[PDB]
Structure 1
Amino acid sequence: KKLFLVFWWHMHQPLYREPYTGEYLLPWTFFHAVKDYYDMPAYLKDFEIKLNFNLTPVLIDQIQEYAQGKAKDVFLEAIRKDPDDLEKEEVEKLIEFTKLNYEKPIYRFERIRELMNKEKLNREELLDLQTLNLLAWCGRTLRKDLKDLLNKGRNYTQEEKEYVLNKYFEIIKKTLSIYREIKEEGKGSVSTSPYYHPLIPILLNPNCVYETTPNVKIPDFAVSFREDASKHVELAKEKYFEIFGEHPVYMWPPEASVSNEALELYYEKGINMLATDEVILKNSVERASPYLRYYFRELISVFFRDKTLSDLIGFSYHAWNAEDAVRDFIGRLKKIHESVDFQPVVFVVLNGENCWEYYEENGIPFLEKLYSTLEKEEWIETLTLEEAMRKEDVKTEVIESVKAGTWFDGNFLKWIGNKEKNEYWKILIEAKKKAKNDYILVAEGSDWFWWQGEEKAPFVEVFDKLFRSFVRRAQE
């Protein structure tokens, strides 16, 4: 009697490329590409398990731009330059980027503490600041190859910095290939999301927010976003088809966000399976076990992720030592395995690139120990999404209706309902009336609304510049 375990790592970045200048205004796609987007599937080279991935189309666009050498990344340019050529504005951004990241485990170099305590940096100190910011984001593959440069920890030269940069771009250039390979080998399924990661239930019917938060104030949606919701899904099918050669039959709904209308749209667009969050399940049915495969109105298959297991990796186990964390995770799977006399399906679904920076050594000890243990446990079978979709020896149930929500408390409050987030929607609504191109779809991404009306400086001014630039460009 097996326990079926399904990892589904979601990868996404909003579009950081300013439409007028073409400049990538933040380096987050570059840094997660070199740290996570290649290395997370590359674990499948060394471990005989199945792992699944979601790639948003807007992320794929950016990965391709960096791989082709076309991305003009302003923070990266400040890294690459000889410090004698740095603008004062570039030295300032270098220091602010360091201070934002200072306390993360992947930044635990004694030298960074030294450099942040100095009143002013000479050329050698700036070279160490640039190169340590680079090396802090080193992924698993190159942490082996560049181990000696990493251990050095100080006194970096321009040549060593450029060497690291060349190896990083080699990693980016191989990134789409590794997703194609693990897919062709049956080592994992690859899904996508509606193109720019929007809140599909809101675009289809903004009133769905009242199913969970009736007291929320939302602006006057004086224009229809229903066609745009279709276009996000349709364009995403086309981008996936270009990259992987087939139309996707699995999709990750952004923010796990579903509604009756959204599920109908995915079904209409040929999606056969998605996943969403256990809170939505609890809100929608009485007996809310997440270990069943659900069928929404016999139209589309829906799995509900195990929220506690997903949150343990996503948020808890950074605060644990790696071995203890793996023992805790396996022990919880044991309890699930023992708690039912059927074969449970256990979906572990979370962002695949954001939690590791808070783990010791970028989560590599944790994931290596976790996957090594999993590959040898005889009562656990890890599945591709395709295997989980067609598994016959599991329990099954039909659901007729869901309560609209997201994996954030089962509601939409992180993207709508306060004055500053509502202002973004009002701006989008007014721009949509006059929109003339697909940059309006870019501005519909959830990321812009997530950061608006929050304390989270800095670079929130940069997300604001991006959103409003996309809104302006959509009208021309």
Structure 2
Amino acid sequence: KKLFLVFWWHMHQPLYREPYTGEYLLPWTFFHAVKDYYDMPAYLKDFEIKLNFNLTPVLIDQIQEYAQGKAKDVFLEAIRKDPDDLEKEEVEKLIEFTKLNYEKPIYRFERIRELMNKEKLNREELLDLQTLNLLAWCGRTLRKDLKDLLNKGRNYTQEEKEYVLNKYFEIIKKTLSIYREIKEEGKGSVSTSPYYHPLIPILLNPNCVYETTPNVKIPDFAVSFREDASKHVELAKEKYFEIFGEHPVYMWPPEASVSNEALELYYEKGINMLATDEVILKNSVERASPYLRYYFRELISVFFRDKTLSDLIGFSYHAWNAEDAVRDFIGRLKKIHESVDFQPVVFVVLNGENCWEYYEENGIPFLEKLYSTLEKEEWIETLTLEEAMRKEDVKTEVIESVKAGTWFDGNFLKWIGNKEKNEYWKILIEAKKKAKNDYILVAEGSDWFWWQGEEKAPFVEVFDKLFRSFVRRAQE
């Protein structure tokens, strides 16, 4: 009797490329590419288990742009430049960016603490700040090549910094290939999402917000987004086929978001399986075991992730020592295993790039201990998505209706329902009436609405500038 364990690491970045200037206004795609997007699948070279990945098409577009040397990245130019050539504005952004990341364990360099305690910075100190910002995002693979520079800790030259950049761009150029490689070796499945990561249920039917939050106020949706919802899915299928050579039969719905109408859309577009959130399961059915393969109206397979295990990795285990966290994780799988007659299916689904920066050593002690330990538990079988979709010896159940929501509390309030978030929807609704091109699809990505109307964090104004630029460009 086995427990079936399915990791599904979701990788996404909204489009940071401003459409009028072509500049990448935040460097987060570059930094998560060099730290995580290559290195998360690359674990499969060293550990013989199954791990699955989701890549949004908008992320893939940006990785390709960086791999070609085409990406004009404003912050990265502030890193690359000799400090003598830095504008005052570029020095401020470098200092701001350091302070934002300063308490993260990946930034724990003695030299950074000293630099941030100085009132002014000369060229040598700025060179250190530039290079250490780069070295802080070093991924597992380059830890070996760059160990000399990591141990040096200070007194970096312009040529050492350019060496690090050259090795980082080599990593980016290999990033799409490693996803192809682990798929072709059978080591993991790769999925995608609707193209710009929108909230499909709201594009199809905004009234679905009332199923969980009946008293919320939303704008007047006087235009249809339903064919845009189709286009997001259709364009992602085309991109996926081009990159990976298959029609996608599974997709990750952005923010785990589902509704009855969204499930019908996915099925109509040929999607046979997806996953979503446990809170949605509990909001929708009575005997709500998340260890079953569900069939929505006998038409599309639906797994519900184990929210606790997914949240433990995402939010809690960063502060634990690696042995304790892995013992706790395995102990929780043991409890699941002993609590049921059948072979349970355990989906662990979370973002694959955002949590590691809070773990000691960028999560490498934790993930190496976890994957090493899973390799030796005979009663746990890690599965690809294809295997989980087809495994015959699992328990199943038919489900006829879901309560629309997302993995944020089972509802849509992170993206709609207050004055500021509603103002973005109103802008989009008005722009949709005059849209002439697919930049209206870009503006439907969930991220713009996520950041809107929150407490003012650094660079939040950049997301707003991008959103409105795509909305403006869509109408021309």
Common fold: TM-score over 0.5: yes
- Give me the whole-angstrom Cα distance separating, in 2, the residues matched to 1:60 and 1:15: 10
CA distance in 2, matches of 1:386, 1:247: 13
1:377-406, CA deviations, whole angstroms, 9 ceiling, x for partnerless residues?
Answer: 111100000000010111000000000000
> Alpha-carbon deviation of 1:333?
0.6
Report Cα offsets for 1:349-371 as digits up to 9, x if no partner.
00000000000000000000000
Q: Distance in 1 between matches of 2:319 and 2:288?
A: 30
Deviates more, 1:401-410 or 1:240-249: 240-249
For residues 433-458 of structure 1, the C-alpha deviation after alignment (integer angstroms, 9 at most, x for no partner) is 00000000000000000000001411
- The residue aligned with 1:423 is 423
Residue 155 of structure 1, CA deviation: 0.9
Gaps in structure 1 of 5+ consecutive residues: none
1:451 & 1:292 partners in 2: Cα distance? 34
Return the offset for 1:153: 1.2
Tell me the distance in 2 between the aligned counterparts of 1:328 and 1:155: 42
Unaligned stretches of 5+ residues in structure 2: none
Per-residue Cα deviation, 1:271-328 (whole angstroms, up to 9, x for no partner): 0100000000000000000000000001100000000000000111011111111111
Task: Give, in angstroms, the shift of residue 430 of structure 1.
Answer: 0.3
Match of 2:20 in 1: 20
Q: Percent identity?
A: 100
Q: For 1:283 and 1:348, how far apart are their aligned partners in 2?
A: 19
1:380 matched to 2:376: no
| Alignment-derived partner of residue 131 in structure 2 | 131
Separation in 2 of the partners of 1:439 and 1:153? 44
Correspondence for 2:441 = 441
How far has the Cα of 1:152 moved from its partner?
1.3
Distance 1:378 1:3 in 2: 9
Deviation at 1:32, TM superposition (A): 0.2
Deviations 1:123-173 (A, max 9, x none): 000000000000000000001221121111111111110000000000000
> Whole-Å Cα distance in 1 between the matches of residues 147 and 321 of structure 2?
22
- Between the aligned partners of 2:14 and 2:127, the Cα distance in structure 1 is 30
Q: Secondary structure at the match of 2:335?
A: helix
Task: Give the match's secondary structure for 1:295.
Answer: strand
Q: Equivalent residue of 1:20, what SS?
A: coil
Q: CA separation in 1, counterparts of 2:146 and 2:456?
A: 33
Match of 1:305 in 2: 305
Measured in 1, the distance between the counterparts of 2:405 and 2:355 equals: 23
CA distance in 1, matches of 2:218, 2:321: 44
Partner secondary structure for residue 453 of structure 2: coil
Aligned counterpart, 1:459: 459
CA distance in 1, matches of 2:207, 2:319: 39
Give the Cα separation in 1 of the matches to 2:458 and 2:125.
24
Equivalent position SS for 1:393: coil
**Cα deviations across residues 165-211 of structure 1 (Å, max 9, x unaligned)?**
00000000000110001001110000000000000000000000000
CA offsets per residue over residues 233-264 of structure 1, 9 Å max, x none?
00000111111112111100000000000000
Equivalenced residue count is 476
Would you identify which runs of 4 or more consecutive aligned residues in structure 1 move more than 4 Å?
none
Task: Tell me whether 332-341 or 30-39 shows the greater mean CA deviation.
Answer: 332-341
Corresponding residue SS for 2:214: coil
- For 1:163 and 1:377, the matched residues in 2 are separated by 42
Other structure's SS at 1:333 match: helix
Please state whether the residue corresponding to 1:120 is helix, strand or coil.
Answer: coil
Q: Determine the C-alpha separation between the residues in 1 that align with 2:148 and 2:358.
A: 22
SS in 2 for 1:9: strand
Distance in 1 of aligned mates of 2:194 and 2:435 = 19
For the residue of structure 1 that corresponds to 2:76, the secondary structure is helix
**Distance in 1 between residues matched to 2:286 and 2:318, nearest whole Å:** 34
The 2-side partners of 1:389 and 1:19 are apart by 40
Task: Please give the alpha-carbon distance, in whole angstroms, between the structure 1 residues aligned to 2:220 and 2:185.
Answer: 49
User: What is the aligned-residue RMSD (CA, Å)?
Assistant: 0.5
Q: Which shows bigger deviation, 168-177 or 142-151?
A: 142-151
Indicate the SS of the match to 1:140: coil
> Within 2, Cα distance between the matches of 1:29 and 1:249?
27
CA distance in 1, matches of 2:40, 2:237: 23
Once the 2 structures are TM-superposed, how far is the Cα of residue 425 of structure 1 from its aligned partner? 0.2
Q: Distance in 2 between matches of 1:272 and 1:295?
A: 10
TM score, norm. by length of structure 1? 1.00
Question: SS at 2:409's partner residue?
Answer: coil
- What TM-score do you get using the length of structure 2 for normalisation? 1.00
The Cα of 1:376 is off from its aligned counterpart by 1.1
- In 2, Cα distance between the equivalents of 1:152 and 1:201? 51
* CA distance in 2: counterparts of 1:379 and 1:144, whole angstroms: 34
Looking at structure 2, the residues matched to 85 and 449 of structure 1 have their Cα atoms a distance apart, in angstroms, of 36
Residue 77 of structure 1 corresponds to: 77
Shift of 1:267: 0.2
